[PDB]
């Protein structure tokens, strides 16, 4: 059984640290002691022998593990485990919006010259994915069409 651990790298060289780590594994052929490597912190499926600990800290541009102590470092205590699996699916099938708009509902604009302005959606168009909202510019309401992502629900 291989449990997870957290590795600190020089922040910015993280993909190169991950590649060098996979290559040090396939050099010193402790292939049965490493499962994956996930991407300034690098997640490693691993077991704990002192040989594998020296291996990961002998990988270049790696500071060390992050745990309670340096004798027996600590398995990443990820509170979200099965929830993190669903959070990876959430980032994967990105939850997107088509035309979040409603009559008389106030909205917020954060894109184009109308950004930083609020208004109401007098008309909505889910088929055209466009919301009809006017902005109080110099007093007169300025009915303009904004996308659901172009404006926020108020």
């Amino acid at each position: 059984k291989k449990r997870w651990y957290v590795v600190q790298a020089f922040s910015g060289f993280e993909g190169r640290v991950a590649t060098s780590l996979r290559e040090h594994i396939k050099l010193h052929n402790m292939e049965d002691l490493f499962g994956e490597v996930m991407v300034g912190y690098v997640l490693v499926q691993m077991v704990m022998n002192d040989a594998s600990w020296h291996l990961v800290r002998s990988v270049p541009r790696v500071m060390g593990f992050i745990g309670g102590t340096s004798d027996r470092p600590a398995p990443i205590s990820d509170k979200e485990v099965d929830a993190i699996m669903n959070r990876l699916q959430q980032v994967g099938d990105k939850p997107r919006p088509k035309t979040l708009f409603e009559p008389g509902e106030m909205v917020r604009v954060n894109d184009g010259p109308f950004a930083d302005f609020n208004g109401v959606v007098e008309e909505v168009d889910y088929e055209k994915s466009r919301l009809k909202v006017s902005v109080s510019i110099f007093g007169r309401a300025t009915p303009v069409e904004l996308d659901f992502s172009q404006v926020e629900k108020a």
Partner: protein, 50 residues
């Protein structure tokens, strides 16, 4: 203030304050995301040292 050339010769306190604000923004984002214990302990420890 800049030097003769034009590159701004920045003071040391701007490095210190900019570090503290970079780390504080990172710590607010990790407490938003509910990172595990060891991540936010290192994050708060880096803020303490900053």
């Amino acid at each position: 203030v800049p030097l003769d050339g034009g590159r701004f010769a920045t003071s040391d306190l701007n490095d210190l304050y900019r570090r503290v604000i970079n780390r504080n923004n990172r710590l607010k984002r990790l407490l938003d995301l509910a990172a595990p214990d060891i991540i936010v302990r290192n994050e708060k420890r880096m803020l303490q040292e900053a």
